[PDB]
Design a protein around this ligand. Sequence first.
Ligand SMILES: [Ag+]
Ligand SMILES: [Ag+]
Lengths: 130, 130
Amino acid sequence: MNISDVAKITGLTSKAIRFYEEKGLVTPPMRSENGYRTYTQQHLNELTLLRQARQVGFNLEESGELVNLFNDPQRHSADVKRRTLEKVAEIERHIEELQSMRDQLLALANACPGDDSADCPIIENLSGCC
Amino acid sequence: MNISDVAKITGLTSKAIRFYEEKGLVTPPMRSENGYRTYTQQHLNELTLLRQARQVGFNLEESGELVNLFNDPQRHSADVKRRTLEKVAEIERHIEELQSMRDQLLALANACPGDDSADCPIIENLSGCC
DNA sequence: GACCTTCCCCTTGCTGGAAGGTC
DNA sequence: GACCTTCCAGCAAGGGGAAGGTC
Ligand SMILES: [Ag+]
Ligand SMILES: [Ag+]
């Protein structure tokens, strides 16, 4: 298969695919006498994994490490679980963080008469003036 | 005041401050016969607002627009509230999104015996193979 | 005109570095 | 020696469109 073929089956863009290849994150596909990248089923799996890892919040470096595990048949299914559970934690800390913001913001907008007067305790609050 | 002074009072770095200035986001401070930026209280407010808007999830463009409002005394305290309430929504959509991920991930790690065997239904699941 | 390739710039929100001019 | 001023370079994670192959 060629790249646009793989693109559409995986939901990745072409540029994305080249980019992962460039970054050492996936196995390079063979070229053809014309240089067109030429993919096999394996590459498909690698890329799909990559994309699916991304959608579920792994970053590239980590998505890559998941791919290095896909390619090790002596892997421990545990070293993944661990990885996967950190990512849950991290996702958890990040949700805490956004709630604090939700909170801080909601406080500010209660106090705002939002009435077309120009005193705006949001602004006043956001800058330490007054 | 000079930049490091303003830096430390606001919690911004110097490079950050120059950068906001460069980007049109804050008022430029006067220079001195030697070119050192030289800040007034106003600039302090502007930058503090900027930083505080950022910590509570506004991006630069939006933080900037809040600053353009701080500098308009004919502003409506309402045009802010609106802005502030969008940012809550957006923060809300973003939390939905991270929960879906938490979910998807948690599913995957239940099923993983995490036992040092090499079948890893996480991987298997993440790539459409098997 | 339909893809394929490499090339580097645009982004967002900064942070670090190295030259040079003050303090 | 530690301030400041400028620009060079780059992190994620790719996008945009050049300039060319070649079927
Ligand atoms: Ag208000
Ligand atoms: Ag597993």
